[PDB]
Design a protein around this nucleic acid. Structure first.
Ligand SMILES: Nc1nc2c(ncn2[C@@H]2O[C@H](COP(=O)(O)O)[C@@H](O)[C@H]2O)c(=O)[nH]1
Ligand SMILES: *C(=O)[C@H](CCSC)NC=O
Ligand SMILES: [Mg+2]
Ligand SMILES: [Mg+2]
Ligand SMILES: [Mg+2]
Ligand SMILES: [Mg+2]
Ligand SMILES: [Mg+2]
Ligand SMILES: [Mg+2]
Ligand SMILES: [Mg+2]
Ligand SMILES: [Mg+2]
Ligand SMILES: [Mg+2]
Ligand SMILES: [Mg+2]
Ligand SMILES: [Mg+2]
Ligand SMILES: [Mg+2]
Ligand SMILES: [Mg+2]
Ligand SMILES: [Mg+2]
Ligand SMILES: [Mg+2]
Ligand SMILES: [Mg+2]
Ligand SMILES: [Mg+2]
Ligand SMILES: [Mg+2]
Ligand SMILES: [Mg+2]
Ligand SMILES: [Mg+2]
Ligand SMILES: [Mg+2]
Ligand SMILES: [Mg+2]
Ligand SMILES: [Mg+2]
Ligand SMILES: [Mg+2]
Ligand SMILES: [Mg+2]
Ligand SMILES: [Mg+2]
Ligand SMILES: [Mg+2]
Ligand SMILES: [Mg+2]
Ligand SMILES: [Mg+2]
Ligand SMILES: [Mg+2]
Ligand SMILES: [Mg+2]
Ligand SMILES: [Mg+2]
Ligand SMILES: [Mg+2]
Ligand SMILES: [Mg+2]
Ligand SMILES: [Mg+2]
Ligand SMILES: [Mg+2]
Ligand SMILES: [Mg+2]
Ligand SMILES: [Mg+2]
Ligand SMILES: [Mg+2]
Ligand SMILES: [Mg+2]
Ligand SMILES: [Mg+2]
Ligand SMILES: [Mg+2]
Ligand SMILES: [Mg+2]
Ligand SMILES: [Mg+2]
Ligand SMILES: [Mg+2]
Ligand SMILES: [Mg+2]
Ligand SMILES: [Mg+2]
Ligand SMILES: [Mg+2]
Ligand SMILES: [Mg+2]
Ligand SMILES: [Mg+2]
Ligand SMILES: [Mg+2]
Ligand SMILES: [Mg+2]
Ligand SMILES: [Mg+2]
Ligand SMILES: [Mg+2]
Ligand SMILES: [Mg+2]
Ligand SMILES: [Mg+2]
Ligand SMILES: [Mg+2]
Ligand SMILES: [Mg+2]
Ligand SMILES: [Mg+2]
Ligand SMILES: [Mg+2]
Ligand SMILES: [Mg+2]
Ligand SMILES: [Mg+2]
Ligand SMILES: [Mg+2]
Ligand SMILES: [Mg+2]
Ligand SMILES: [Mg+2]
Ligand SMILES: [Mg+2]
Ligand SMILES: [Mg+2]
Ligand SMILES: [Mg+2]
Ligand SMILES: [Mg+2]
Ligand SMILES: [Mg+2]
Ligand SMILES: [Mg+2]
Ligand SMILES: [Mg+2]
Ligand SMILES: [Mg+2]
Ligand SMILES: [Mg+2]
Ligand SMILES: [Mg+2]
Ligand SMILES: [Mg+2]
Ligand SMILES: [Mg+2]
Ligand SMILES: [Mg+2]
Ligand SMILES: [Mg+2]
Ligand SMILES: [Mg+2]
Ligand SMILES: [Mg+2]
Ligand SMILES: [Mg+2]
Ligand SMILES: [Mg+2]
Ligand SMILES: [Mg+2]
Ligand SMILES: [Mg+2]
Ligand SMILES: [Mg+2]
Ligand SMILES: [Mg+2]
Ligand SMILES: [Mg+2]
Ligand SMILES: [Mg+2]
Ligand SMILES: [Mg+2]
Ligand SMILES: [Mg+2]
Ligand SMILES: [Mg+2]
Ligand SMILES: [Mg+2]
Ligand SMILES: [Mg+2]
Ligand SMILES: [Mg+2]
Ligand SMILES: [Mg+2]
Ligand SMILES: [Mg+2]
Ligand SMILES: [Zn+2]
Lengths: 246, 110, 153
RNA sequence: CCAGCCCUAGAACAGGGCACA
RNA sequence: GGGUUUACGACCUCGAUGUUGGAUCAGGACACCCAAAUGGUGCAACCGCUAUUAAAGGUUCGUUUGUUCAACGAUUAAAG
RNA sequence: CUAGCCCAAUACCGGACUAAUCUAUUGAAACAUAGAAGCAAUAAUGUUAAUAUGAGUAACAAGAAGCCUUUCUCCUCGCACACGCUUACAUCAGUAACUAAUAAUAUACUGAUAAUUAACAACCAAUAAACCAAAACAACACUAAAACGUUUAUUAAUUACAUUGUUAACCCAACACAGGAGUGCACCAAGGAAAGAUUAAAAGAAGUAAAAGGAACUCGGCAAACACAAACCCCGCCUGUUUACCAAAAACAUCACCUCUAGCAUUACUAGUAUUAGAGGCAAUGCCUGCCCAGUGACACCAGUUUAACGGCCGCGGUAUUCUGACCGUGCAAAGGUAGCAUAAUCACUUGUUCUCCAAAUAAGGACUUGUAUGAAUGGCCACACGAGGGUUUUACUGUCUCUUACUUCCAAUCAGUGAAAUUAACCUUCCCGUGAAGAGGCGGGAAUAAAAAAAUAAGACGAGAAGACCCUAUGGAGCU
RNA sequence: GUUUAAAAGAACCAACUCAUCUAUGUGGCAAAAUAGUGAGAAGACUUGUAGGUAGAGGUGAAAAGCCUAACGAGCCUGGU
RNA sequence: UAUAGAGAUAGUACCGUAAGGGAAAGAUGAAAGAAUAAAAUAAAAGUAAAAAAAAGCAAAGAUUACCCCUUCUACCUUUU
RNA sequence: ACCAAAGCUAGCUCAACAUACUAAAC
């Protein structure tokens, strides 16, 4: 007669069991971006001409002292590190990561992108179908800036490299029922992004992993969705009156 | 008396699925033209009545705070005014309750 | 067989029903608007009308005085009944109360509930059910019929 | 036609009334 | 010929078919007590005695007794 | 006839195969040959666990409004201690679910934190002597002879603060149970709420009222009543005790009266001593208790004595015209039933006969009385008082009844929440006649027959409940003599 | 409390103790209760605490009663 | 191999005043410091998906066709 | 589709040997 129920699922963590951990948390990456590169508002008009863009890009890459000392730090920490063959590897990593997210290959996707890039690109898409492809690239990827974050508590250095890409992709996100949701699979839309890769320099392996994706604030808005959206108003209690904002 | 045999699921279903035991649909449901909530055509609106009841409870709370006793009822009429209002020539000589809230849109001055 | 019965059985008997109605009438006189069960309010409405009539009978009437003394349990409401409720009901004949069925009680009993209110009180007006305007299709058709009947005379 | 409200109609469901006033 | 009494038999029930009288409600048979239609009489009349047909409807209230019965009081068209 | 694998079955008997396991050798998309067994479940009112039917049925709960804990309507088992339970107590927070037989939330669930502080209570001198003289307002007394104390002498470590019980809405009854519970205070100044919300069907429970009659009802005046009185018998003298849980009595005990058994000392009887103490009978009191020691007991160890010890107290025939038999003959006994009462609580006949009571009586009371089976301490006859004992009358009273009715409350029906029980082979679960393990829903011959709810009545399901308690059987028991 | 020269195994009637009769209840509030009505109520009276008598027995104002909800003889264990 | 094997997760909860009796209850993964957690059965009885339409031990012969037609007195035990 | 279902382990049983037989905590 005396019986009760069990399995009341509750998640309650405290600072005492958080800090009495025997081994610290090994992080293969940092939280976010330390020094975000703010691009000039004239990219849309300088990307039209080849020489006037590449010249300014090389000037910005060579004249900044912070980027130069960071490249020197990466060079002294790991040999055979050159910036000339870096954009090709960055483009390869980008295309293979997008193909891995297309094929739903979470293992190779984890090997390619880092722990800050994986959730932001798998969470809202794990229940959908993607048809992404690579057709053309008008402007080759260009290394904009290079930064390095050194924390002396553990003695760990993370080298981040920002690469501006002008890419031409075909994106089509389908629904879990099979209907088209976002865009067509044949329209080669032009995208401009700034991929921030990161690498742990103290690590013996130290693979290059995509860390962040910067979009300029003046970038054109994304393509409209196919369906319509209703935005609800403030759900009013009986003893509350609506206030019309003007 | 005790049952002679076990009633089968067939007869049990025939008994407790008869339309006499099913929940009947209501056709007197309408929307309230004021707040848009659902109500019956012969019953007051729950939302509007809750608004009026909250306002009435606040008014009664203030009018009871005005009278420091349980057996202290006014022998004159009463008038409730809101922030930014003054007693008229017809409302003078009565008890006055003053609310800091602005006058609601449904409360008519009269 | 309950043919020709006008009072419903309430409480623990006739005296208990009288006491329940007396408490309800005291509350109604005090607050000018109360809410209770639909049956109890429907039973109390007639007593409220008769109480307003007895209050209109005057202050110096010993019958009305003792009736108010019996019914109004809180003795501070008898001057109220005789100097607020009765004077403000002078041109009216029988339209003293307003009873409206409110939704069922949110408690588990789901009782059929009503609200009773003395007309002309200092409280927010209940959301009374208003009829349709004359600008409705059917009402405009009936207005046209009425105008035709007026012109035909 | 049957929301509601009354009933000399009724356990529930049914049934009779709701314009004179 | 019937299966109302007592008996006879021991066929169904002893992992239960509860046993007399009453109260309530009665269903049915007729081998009819009354009521209805007749025959015979040693049927004068009133009362009777038998027999035939008919079962839609009735068939009382009390004292004693646990009583079914039984005795008694008052009646009823009769108290089957 | 055409093909075959070429002739039914209960108890018992025989044979050939065989499911699933383990082992020894094969096999390795799960098998073969052998050897072993905890070797096969449609049935034991079978065991365990889970599920259905009954059934969303029986049943269960929170007074009202309100400014939200403030005022109204009612009923009154409250405070403390002892005993007992141990934190269920207090503050804060939460309740989706678990406890409250439902919610609201919370003294009854969950978690954290706190608490009951000694002056009240517990533990808190011995050794000898003086001590007969009750408590009951105790002045003074009665019988049943009655707890409760000081003083004197010898030793009693001697020096602040020791230890322990301090909450509660509580205990014993499987339960937050209409039950059982010691003591001192008061009857409210303290405790609480009969209704979750409607309607006002039947039936059921409780109450109030009722024309005329007033027991005509019924086993009975049971119950009820505006009555709450007077008498007659039976049985027990009376008060009292008894079958906890179907019998409270006429049963037991009882004062009184009778029998037996004992001449006596350190644990009963008894710290008593025949006017005493035990083992018993019968029942106050009044009149009495008649005969018998033949048998069986007990004293006497054989005679003999004992019945207020166990127990018994007679036939057959004729007689005073015609009915009885004062009387006689004969026989057996230990004596042959005395007084009294008597159709009784007394075998049957019996509803014996008669008088009173009633209009009517197998009722009650008074008489007659062989009761051939009454009867005298296993006691017989009357009497006062007494009895929730068993019967009978007289008024009074009334719904007991003629002959029921009206209205309230709990029930009831609907709505909302929670939610059992006996029972159940499966049912797609009609009626009549017949038949049949001898009373049919299931068979036969006929009639009837859209399907499902809800509310009522109990004729049947040889309805449920309890392996009939009556009867019999058992080479089954047990109590008593 | 009342009546009594009375604390009289007297009387009326409370607390209290029993349980006469009826009606509900009958898997119920309850493995014996509720309501009304009853009997005793200064005594052979009720009752608190603590101890004793233990089953071939105890105790018994004999009902073959009671001895931890089933007693013509408790319950548990073992024989089993 | 968790209704088995010791009663045993334990002589513990719980039931009795006591002696004494005496249980049931475990199942992921290398990692849950992999619960926007991943895969195999979705196979008992009981329900839902999906209440029922004359007639009858509920089936069989069948049939274009679920019933409608025709035929068969549930099973064990105990008994003549 | 709910209710549910399946693990292989905890451990037990019977013997042999055996120090020689009321474990640990006290
Ligand atoms: N003694 C005896 N009993 C028989 C014989 N045959 C049948 N029975 C009994 O009859 C019963 C079964 O009836 P049956 O199956 O023979 O009709 C069983 O009790 C069985 O023992 C017989 O030949 N001799
Ligand atoms: C007699 O017929 C019997 C009585 C037994 S009571 C001693 N009744 C039923 O079996
Ligand atoms: Mg109509
Ligand atoms: Mg016969
Ligand atoms: Mg014969
Ligand atoms: Mg026989
Ligand atoms: Mg024979
Ligand atoms: Mg029998
Ligand atoms: Mg049977
Ligand atoms: Mg008849
Ligand atoms: Mg005839
Ligand atoms: Mg005639
Ligand atoms: Mg007849
Ligand atoms: Mg042949
Ligand atoms: Mg054969
Ligand atoms: Mg084999
Ligand atoms: Mg076996
Ligand atoms: Mg099985
Ligand atoms: Mg049974
Ligand atoms: Mg059964
Ligand atoms: Mg079985
Ligand atoms: Mg159910
Ligand atoms: Mg319900
Ligand atoms: Mg039912
Ligand atoms: Mg009910
Ligand atoms: Mg306890
Ligand atoms: Mg609850
Ligand atoms: Mg708590
Ligand atoms: Mg206390
Ligand atoms: Mg009510
Ligand atoms: Mg209540
Ligand atoms: Mg209620
Ligand atoms: Mg009724
Ligand atoms: Mg009645
Ligand atoms: Mg009366
Ligand atoms: Mg009368
Ligand atoms: Mg009579
Ligand atoms: Mg009679
Ligand atoms: Mg009486
Ligand atoms: Mg009397
Ligand atoms: Mg009298
Ligand atoms: Mg006596
Ligand atoms: Mg005397
Ligand atoms: Mg005694
Ligand atoms: Mg008894
Ligand atoms: Mg007793
Ligand atoms: Mg009795
Ligand atoms: Mg008595
Ligand atoms: Mg005697
Ligand atoms: Mg003498
Ligand atoms: Mg005697
Ligand atoms: Mg005598
Ligand atoms: Mg003698
Ligand atoms: Mg002798
Ligand atoms: Mg001799
Ligand atoms: Mg005489
Ligand atoms: Mg006799
Ligand atoms: Mg009589
Ligand atoms: Mg004799
Ligand atoms: Mg004698
Ligand atoms: Mg003698
Ligand atoms: Mg008497
Ligand atoms: Mg007595
Ligand atoms: Mg008596
Ligand atoms: Mg009437
Ligand atoms: Mg049928
Ligand atoms: Mg047969
Ligand atoms: Mg048979
Ligand atoms: Mg038949
Ligand atoms: Mg047939
Ligand atoms: Mg037939
Ligand atoms: Mg025919
Ligand atoms: Mg029946
Ligand atoms: Mg019934
Ligand atoms: Mg049958
Ligand atoms: Mg029967
Ligand atoms: Mg039966
Ligand atoms: Mg038997
Ligand atoms: Mg019996
Ligand atoms: Mg016998
Ligand atoms: Mg034999
Ligand atoms: Mg033997
Ligand atoms: Mg006395
Ligand atoms: Mg009583
Ligand atoms: Mg009464
Ligand atoms: Mg009393
Ligand atoms: Mg008395
Ligand atoms: Mg007396
Ligand atoms: Mg003792
Ligand atoms: Mg013996
Ligand atoms: Mg003895
Ligand atoms: Mg005896
Ligand atoms: Mg006896
Ligand atoms: Mg016992
Ligand atoms: Mg086990
Ligand atoms: Mg076990
Ligand atoms: Mg299934
Ligand atoms: Mg058929
Ligand atoms: Mg037989
Ligand atoms: Zn509204």
């Amino acid at each position: 007669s005396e019986k009760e129920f069990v399995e009341h699922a509750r998640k309650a963590g405290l600072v005492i069991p958080h800090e009495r951990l025997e081994r610290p948390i090994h992080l293969a990456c940092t939280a976010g971006i330390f020094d975000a590169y703010v691009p000039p508002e004239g990219d849309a008009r300088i990307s039209s001409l080849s020489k006037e863009g590449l010249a300014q890009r090389a000037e910005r890459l060579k004249k900044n002292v912070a980027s130069q000392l960071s490249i020197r730090k990466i060079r002294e920490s790991d040999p055979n590190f050159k910036i000339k063959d870096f954009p090709e590897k960055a483009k390869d990593i980008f295309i293979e990561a997008h193909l891995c997210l297309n094929n739903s290959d979470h293992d190779r996707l984890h090997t390619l992108v880092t722990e800050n890039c994986f959730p932001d690109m798998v969470w809202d898409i794990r229940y959908k179908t993607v048809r992404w492809s690579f057709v053309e690239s008008l402007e080759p990827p260009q290394v904009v800036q290079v930064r390095c974050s050194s924390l002396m508590n553990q003695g760990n250095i993370y080298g981040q490299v920002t690469v501006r890409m002008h890419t031409r992709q075909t994106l089509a996100i389908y629904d879990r029922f099979g209907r088209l949701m976002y865009g067509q699979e044949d329209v080669p839309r032009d995208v401009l992004e700034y991929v921030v890769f990161e690498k742990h320099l103290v690590d013996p392996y130290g693979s290059w992993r995509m860390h962040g994706k910067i979009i300029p604030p003046w970038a054109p808005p994304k393509q409209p969705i196919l369906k319509t959206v209703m935005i609800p108003g403030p759900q009013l209690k009986p003893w509350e009156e609506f206030e019309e904002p003007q | 008396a005790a049952p002679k045999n076990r009633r089968s699921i067939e007869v049990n279903r025939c008994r407790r699925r008869n339309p006499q035991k099913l929940i009947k649909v209501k056709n007197n449901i309408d929307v309230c033209p004021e707040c848009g909530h659902l109500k019956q055509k012969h019953i007051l609106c729950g939302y509007c009545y809750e608004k009026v009841r909250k306002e009435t409870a606040e008014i009664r709370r203030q009018m009871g705070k005005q009278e420091g006793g349980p057996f202290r009822a006014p022998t004159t009429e009463t008038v409730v005014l809101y922030s930014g209002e003054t007693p008229s020539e017809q409302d003078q000589g009565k008890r006055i309750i003053e609310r800091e809230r602005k006058r609601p849109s449904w409360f008519t001055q009269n | 067989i309950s043919h020709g019965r006008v009072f419903r059985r309430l409480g623990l008997g006739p005296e208990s029903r009288i006491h329940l109605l007396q408490n309800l009438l005291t509350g109604l006189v005090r607050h000018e608007r109360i809410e209770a069960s639909w049956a109890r309010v429907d039973e109390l409405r007639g007593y409220a009308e008769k109480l307003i009539d007895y209050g209109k009978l005057g202050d110096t009437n010993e019958r009305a005085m003792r009736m108010a003394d019996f019914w109004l349990t809180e003795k501070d409401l008898i001057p109220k009944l005789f100097q607020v409720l009765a004077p403000r009901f002078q041109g009216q004949n029988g339209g003293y109360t307003r009873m409206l069925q409110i939704p069922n009680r949110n408690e588990q009993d789901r009782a059929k509930m009503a609200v009773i209110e003395y007309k002309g009180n200092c409280l927010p007006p209940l959301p009374l059910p208003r009829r349709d305007s004359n600008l409705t299709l059917l009402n405009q058709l009936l207005q046209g019929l009425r105008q035709d009947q007026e012109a035909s005379s």
